[PDB]
Amino acid sequence: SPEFMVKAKSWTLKKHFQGKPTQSDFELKTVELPPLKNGEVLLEALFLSVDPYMRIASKRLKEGAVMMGQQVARVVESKNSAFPAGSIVLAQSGWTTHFISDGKGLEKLLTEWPDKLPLSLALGTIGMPGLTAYFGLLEVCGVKGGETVLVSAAAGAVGSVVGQIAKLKGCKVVGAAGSDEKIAYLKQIGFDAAFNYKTVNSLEEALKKASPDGYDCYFDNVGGEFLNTVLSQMKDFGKIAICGAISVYNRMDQLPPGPSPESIIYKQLRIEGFIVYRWQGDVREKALRDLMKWVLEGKIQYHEHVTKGFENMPAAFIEMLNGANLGKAVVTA
Amino acid sequence: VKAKSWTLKKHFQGKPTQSDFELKTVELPPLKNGEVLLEALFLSVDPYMRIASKRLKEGAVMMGQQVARVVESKNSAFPAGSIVLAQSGWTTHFISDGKGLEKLLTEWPDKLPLSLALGTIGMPGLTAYFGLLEVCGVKGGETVLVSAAAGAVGSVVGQIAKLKGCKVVGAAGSDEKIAYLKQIGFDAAFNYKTVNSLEEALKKASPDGYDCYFDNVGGEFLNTVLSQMKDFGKIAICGAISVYNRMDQLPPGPSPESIIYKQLRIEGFIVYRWQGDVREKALRDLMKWVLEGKIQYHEHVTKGFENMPAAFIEMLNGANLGKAVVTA
């Protein structure tokens, strides 16, 4: 009988980003949630993800609207038999502490989830970033064993998974990241070579040392000038998997000088863009099962860059874009 | 026998000019056993020379292919009177040991000028053939966009696309070329220099986008094209002539948004990838299509060897409608 009010705090986009996003570009809001109707569920955020795509997606957002994003949430109350109270779901509810859903876009976490594995992994290694790495490496680059893979943003969510999957498939992997701490971490988890792209004397020389015979596949997470230099190091018929281009996300209106036609033509390179969502159904489930299996087998180690508290979400996002994160950037409510 | 040759006096900076070239005359030594004396008949000028020249040491002879006649021979495989395709560079006479020489397709029809062996029924025609059929991999019904459409490669791409049952849109740099493109079969053709907006022109030519873009120009044009590609669309990077004069200062790169969200497949290629029987078969097809009238042709002929640099300079500037060819 007793009814208790549920307050939902949400992070809104106060002002569109100009260059690097800043705290002031965000505005916290609180709203009293209405009662649950039949077929609806009340969700309470447990772990919220901040991702690079939010920098671009925020452009199609009207100022004042809630920032987009996925989170792991617990069903606190339920009037929907498919999502019982207490169950855990993945929801594209945006940056909010509580959310009422009719169950439409909700995704149940992988069945038989191990107690030892934090639920937040469903937002990284055993989630979208991990799936991105899986399909970009295995399908787009199509590695079969013995090839040499280069991966940028190597100590990041996607990058760290790419390198480890490449290693378990029997490939040689070289990684590029932005800090000495990250480089040490990469060598710890199996990367054959790794270098701090910020402190190189020569990007080209760094790549040459890492792999003298060149690269079979380049999993591109950064684009820009880095991509331009990588093309000269690709093996003939090499493949470039265009996953993202974070180096230009803050300057989409001032794109740097483009790639050289010389390398693309003479080396007959294949460049392909892809989005995780191209893979669905059974193939997507098998990928999740594989990622889970590989984590349980110790083949894919992980690390989460946790930011405590919902009120610190803008900071977690900003800092992730700036490279503060080693592994998946996750925010605990 | 005094051979005249065009040398690179000074590396090109931006647009190449006449003074960058220097004509040299040398008396040739006698032929040694196994050698032959070639006499240039038709010499080709091509966009790639603008890039390959960067690797040359100043004073060296410009690189290139030509159709030549054997006028003196000490090699049984090439008796006097034979016609060959030789990579002899910009020269009126050349001594070869025969190793790099290529004989023209057997059964070559008298009605077809020999210079076609340097174009439509040669390297440029093969580039169009393989880039369209293998790189774009069109099977029929697709909408194909081709830049430098009225050029040597472009003109063949558009016509092969048409005979394969595709819709073809071409972009070129003059109204004269646009009229020509329509007369030979292109479904749509526009002047990229005078259209109010490249994007509007592309949209009007194909409201539902493009399945394959045969890229001969690159640069800003390519960047604009990406937004009009259908999802999973293929771009055949054949060339990027719009940046050949500014390789050291490339224009803004392509948008990651288009490549990623549309999941585009971009692939560079070189004609030389296809060799042997497949290459010979392609030449046969091109030959047949020309004889059947499916592939019409036009050559932009410049008279006189002394005018070779001008032919090269103007071709890069877009003066040519069809293959740029120089008669000795």
Ligand SMILES: NC(=O)c1ccc[n+]([C@@H]2O[C@H](COP(=O)([O-])OP(=O)(O)OC[C@H]3O[C@@H](n4cnc5c(N)ncnc54)[C@H](OP(=O)(O)O)[C@@H]3O)[C@@H](O)[C@H]2O)c1
């Ligand atoms: N196509 C798809 O479906 C898809 C899906 C998910 C993600 N992506 C893309 O995948 C990439 C990685 O995403 P993620 O979620 O795994 O993020 P993440 O790598 O965990 O975090 C982003 C990382 O990017 C690096 N970075 C920031 N600015 C940079 C710059 N100017 N140059 C080079 N590196 C820079 C930083 O590492 P520092 O030490 O290394 O430099 C930062 O930690 C992003 O480009 C993202 O857009 C694509």
Ligand SMILES: NC(=O)c1ccc[n+]([C@@H]2O[C@H](COP(=O)([O-])OP(=O)(O)OC[C@H]3O[C@@H](n4cnc5c(N)ncnc54)[C@H](OP(=O)(O)O)[C@@H]3O)[C@@H](O)[C@H]2O)c1
């Ligand atoms: N990968 C390979 O194996 C291979 C082989 C042969 C050729 N190619 C490339 O294929 C392309 C066509 O070669 P081709 O022999 O057939 O030459 P072509 O097209 O007969 O002549 C070059 C034409 O390029 C156009 N052009 C020049 N500057 C331009 C600019 N800034 N923007 C747009 N168009 C410009 C001009 O036509 P407009 O009047 O239309 O501007 C000019 O007539 C070149 O890029 C060449 O490098 C590649």
Ligand SMILES: [Cl-]
């Ligand atoms: Cl924004």
Ligand SMILES: [Cl-]
């Ligand atoms: Cl911006």
Ligand SMILES: [Cl-]
């Ligand atoms: Cl930071």
Ligand SMILES: [Cl-]
């Ligand atoms: Cl030069």
Ligand SMILES: [Cl-]
């Ligand atoms: Cl230059």
Ligand SMILES: [Cl-]
């Ligand atoms: Cl001209």
